[PDB]
């Protein structure tokens, strides 16, 4: 499947310290977000030399996910102290800038391992993204090798598509039956 994350079974729960968008530390769980779709995405490392345009895209367009009643959550193996430092380092100096999404800290590497995206040899997450429905069931697995980023558009397409199918399963009995009277000659 993916280390422990199985399509159609409940997404592995984590409890972890996150840096919320207001700059506070909160202890959140995936189960805290039952009732909402969750886009849970790992990135390798804070404070690398790469323009973090991928993470920023998800933060910038967080409104479009809130409109679809879904929460975007980012994660890496870096401490919450590091996440906070990276947020409060301005982009101009190779930082991240402020965020509209919470950033989860996975220092024990247990969450990365549960979602099957731990690169063992370097002790860091691959570029993994997981879509989890309002009932906490895993619906989608995306995992990219380190050099290739994820599209916010493709992520929205998937969330809308899963939600579409979810919605046309709120159905009442038909009130109609076939028989002599309904047959086409």
């Amino acid at each position: 499947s993916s280390g422990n994350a199985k399509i159609g079974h409940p997404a592995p729960n984590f409890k972890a310290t996150a840096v919320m968008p207001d700059g506070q530390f909160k202890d959140i769980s995936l189960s805290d977000y039952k009732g909402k779709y969750v886009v849970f995405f790992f990135y390798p490392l804070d404070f690398t030399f790469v323009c973090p345009t991928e993470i920023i895209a998800f933060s910038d367009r967080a409104e479009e996910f809130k409109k679809l009643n879904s929460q975007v959550i980012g994660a890496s193996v870096d401490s919450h102290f590091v996440h906070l430092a990276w947020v409060n380092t301005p982009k101009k100096q190779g930082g991240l800038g402020p965020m509209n999404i919470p950033l989860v800290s996975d220092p024990k590497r247990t969450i990365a391992q549960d979602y099957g995206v731990l690169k063992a040899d370097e002790g860091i997450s691959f570029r993994g993204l997981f879509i989890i429905d309002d009932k906490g069931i895993l619906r989608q697995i995306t995992v990219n090798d380190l050099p290739v980023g994820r599209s916010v558009d493709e992520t929205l397409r998937l969330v809308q598509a899963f939600q579409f199918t979810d919605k046309h399963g709120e159905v009442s009995p038909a009130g109609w039956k076939p028989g002599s009277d309904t047959i086409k000659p």
Binding site: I7, G8, D133, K135, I137, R139, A161, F162, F164, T165, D166, H168, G169, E170, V171, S172, P173, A174, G175, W176, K177, P178, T182, I183, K184
Partner: protein, 106 residues
């Protein structure tokens, strides 16, 4: 010129009772093309295959997964019904199409 899902009874199924839970990517050229073939020659267009599934308390549900273009055509012509062959099926058949979107049908 028939179907390998329902090769006897063809019914006039009201568009309003068909559950179509899979999003359709329709090429509006093929839709417009079929819309004309429906007005000009109804007997050209096969009937669609709908799955008739009974819930846990015997409630009837009619699922259309196919004839994406044909359905779209009859929808444009704001028709009340579409020619369809019914195939009785199980809640376990439905799980192949919907996965974790499969509802707990009553």
């Amino acid at each position: 010129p028939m179907s390998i899902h329902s090769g006897a009874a063809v019914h006039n199924v009201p568009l309003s009772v068909l559950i179509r839970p899979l999003p359709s990517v329709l090429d509006p050229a093929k839709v417009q093309s079929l819309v004309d073939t429906i007005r000009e020659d109804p007997d050209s267009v096969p009937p669609i295959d709908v799955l008739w599934i009974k819930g846990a308390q015997g409630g009837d549900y009619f699922y259309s997964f196919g004839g994406c273009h044909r359905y779209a055509a009859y929808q444009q012509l704001q028709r009340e019904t579409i020619p369809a062959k019914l195939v009785q099926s199980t809640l376990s058949d439905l799980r192949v199409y919907l996965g974790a979107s499969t509802p707990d049908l009553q």
